[PDB]
Ligand SMILES: Nc1ncnc2c1ncn2[C@@H]1O[C@H](COP(=O)(O)O)[C@@H](O)[C@H]1O
Ligand SMILES: O=C(O)/C=C/C(=O)O
Ligand SMILES: [Ca+2]
């Protein structure tokens with residue numbers, strides 16, 4: 016039935032969901048026009064009192080019976096941190112940083128951080144706002160070349176890193192003279208691998224003659240608890256226009272986020288990106304977050320639950336190896352997926368089908384969908400949203416058949432904020448739009464059946480610029496002040512839009528046909544044999560190739576050579592037949608990769624998107640050699 020009825024039924028039978036309903040009085044107080052961002056956050060966190068705010072998987076420390084090594088092992092439960100405790104921890108960090116005897120920090124300085132998403136990272140983010148720092152969250156998969164370049168541009172006074180990334184942090188700090196302090200977070204007292212990582216970091220710094228101080232965030236909080244709270248708001252140079260955050264995207268360019276635009280994450284217009292946050296019903300917001308804080312989508316969900324009195328459960332591991340465990344324990348009411356997560360779930364379903372030898376829409380097949388919905392994903396899902404990348408209709412249909420709720424598609428960017436939701440512009444923040452012909456790619460407003468062109472918009476959430484890069488900023492605005500999305504869209508009904516592709520992903524083959532490479536990647540990603548695919552073309556050639564990571568099942572059946580190429584070929588031609596793709600849209604030959612694209616190896620971005628230039632760097636020589644061999 017309707018969302019209103021399903022919400023009412025859930026809160027009538029589920030005490031945890033009932034208690035997570037927003038309190039309108041808290042939001043009204045926190046969002047008043049007179050309050051600065053730091054005061055807004057404080058009003059939300061203090062307003063929700065002792066409610067659970069954040070949850071992380073519990074762990075135990077065991078001694079290995081052979082070596083005596085003290086090892087952490089996850090336990091089958093989450094432990095929560097209340098709104099009160101989160102605010103107290105963030106104030107403790109702010110107090111310690113501001114009053115440090117040798118390397119205090121002051122408003123307007125920069126802090127750069129490398130981590131995933133966690134209670135500690137959230138506390139450090141908030142503390143940065145309380146102090147008036149500018150935060151620079153760095154990609155965990157970036158090379159040290161990239162880290163050093165961003166650190167040179169931003170000259171941070173403080174560097175923060177999770178234990179996992181501490182070696183890269185040390186390398187960056189050593190080459191960045193502005194760094195005075197290195198804070199280590201997600202540090203687990205008593206765990207040998209964490210203690211050894213911090214000792215090694217201290218030793219490397221000492222060997223280099225560095226004056227950088229190393230402290231765990233555990234220690235920073237313990238010292239800060241006994242210190243007076245810093246006064247809010249911080250004494251920055253520009254009020255609501257002070258620089259609060261830089262979101263590096265793409266040297267990568269840093270999108271500037273003033274306080275007023277960070278405030279939109281905290282009960283502002285971002286609650287309309289993937290849902291109807293404006294009008295009833297008010298859905299209790301219990302959510303699992305698997306997105307790094309370095310990506311805007313990580314911020315949307317996390318600050319969304321914090322600003323609505325709900326709860327964010329953090330996935331236990333960045334590589335997603337605990338995904339189903341965590342969703343089954345957390346049992347969220349609201350889902351946010353991106354396509355690579357939807358593909359993973361589809362692959363899980365296909366992998367069950369094959370293990371038990373059941374077919375398409377059999378009773379057994381439907382029982383796997385039911386178990387996914389009710390057990391693995393928790394059975395409490397009321398709403399679901401997706402975004403950050405295109406998804407094929409077939410994958411959308413699968414996900415909706417599993418969840419038995421509509422999957423909202425939200426389109427937006429770091430630069431513009433949320434732009435549309437289920438084809439319709441999000442207004443506010445969007446105030447004006449137009450389509451721009453792209454003749455060199457064959458996209459015109461006179462196209463049939465639908466006008467097509469690059470989307471340009473005026474919007475309240477537009478970035479003021481890229482940090483220290485006014486020439487790059489000028490390139491993304493036209494002469495009338497519209498922001499150029501770089502994205503080709505079709506207007507399929509009045510003020511309703513569908514994504515075609517990024518301009519950068521559109522390729523003109525040698526016989527003059529145009530291909531939207533990410534549309535093809537989304538289509539072929541649904542092959543039961545494909546784990547990942549990157550479609551590759553050349554202006555000098557008349558046909559496409561692809562890098563394909565087969566599923567473990569495909570590799571076990573066909574190997575990694577000619578046999579699996581032939582099976583993949585059949586599967587892709589099948590998809591081309593069903594979805595009406597042209598013959599020139601079908602990859603003719605393949606580079607087979609048994610090593611998945613990952614965030615760790617840098618081929619996926621923090622958001623899980625396949626980075627075309629990283630694929631090109633790793634496989635481009637082999638792809639071009641295959642073109643030459645075949646010619
Ligand atoms: N719902 C969506 N459908 C298709 N592509 C999307 C969607 N949302 C975001 N994108 C893509 O992601 C880009 C923004 O990425 P980011 O700046 O990481 O949010 C856009 O310019 C599009 O290429
Ligand atoms: O869905 C949004 O509004 C943002 C998307 C992105 O930057 O990927
Ligand atoms: Ca700790």
Ligand SMILES: [Ca+2]
Pocket residue numbers: 489490491492493494
């Ligand atoms: Ca311009």
